[PDB]
Structure 1
Amino acid sequence: HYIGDLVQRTEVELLKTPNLGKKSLTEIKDVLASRGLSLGMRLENWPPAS
């Protein structure tokens, strides 16, 4: 649900997700990776709100 866990998810698990083809994957790519974020990374201070 949250991208807080999708940050620990590379593109390998994109097309392996059931029912992700051409246009749905197109949107998943566009409206995600065009806003500055990157599909797959690692942070350290998400729990304590700091």
Structure 2
Amino acid sequence: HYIGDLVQRTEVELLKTPNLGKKSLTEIKDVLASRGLSLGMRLENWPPASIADE
């Protein structure tokens, strides 16, 4: 539901599932061109330190 969950998983792991399509790969590339998501990161589960509970 959140793009943080998309950034938590690798692009190779998403490419190993056929739920994404060929045009969806191009859309994912267009989204990752801004380098805000799908940059190959690893989170704790959800929250960064700036994302703190208060």
- Normalised TM-score (structure 1): 0.52
Q: How many residues align?
A: 50
Residues 2-44 of structure 1, C-alpha deviations (whole Å, 9 max, x = no match): 1222222112112223232321210111123334444321356
Higher helix share: 2
Contact 2:5-2:46 within 8 A present in 1 as well: no
CA distance in 2 between partners of 1:45 and 1:20 (Å) = 23
Return 5+ residue gaps in structure 2 as ranges.
Answer: none
RMSD over equivalenced CA pairs, Å: 3.1
Q: 1:19 to 1:43 in 2, by over 3 A?
A: closer
**TM-score normalized by the length of structure 2:** 0.51
3 and 22 in structure 1: CA distance in 2 versus 1, 3 angstrom threshold = same
- The answer for unaligned runs of 5 or more in structure 1 is none
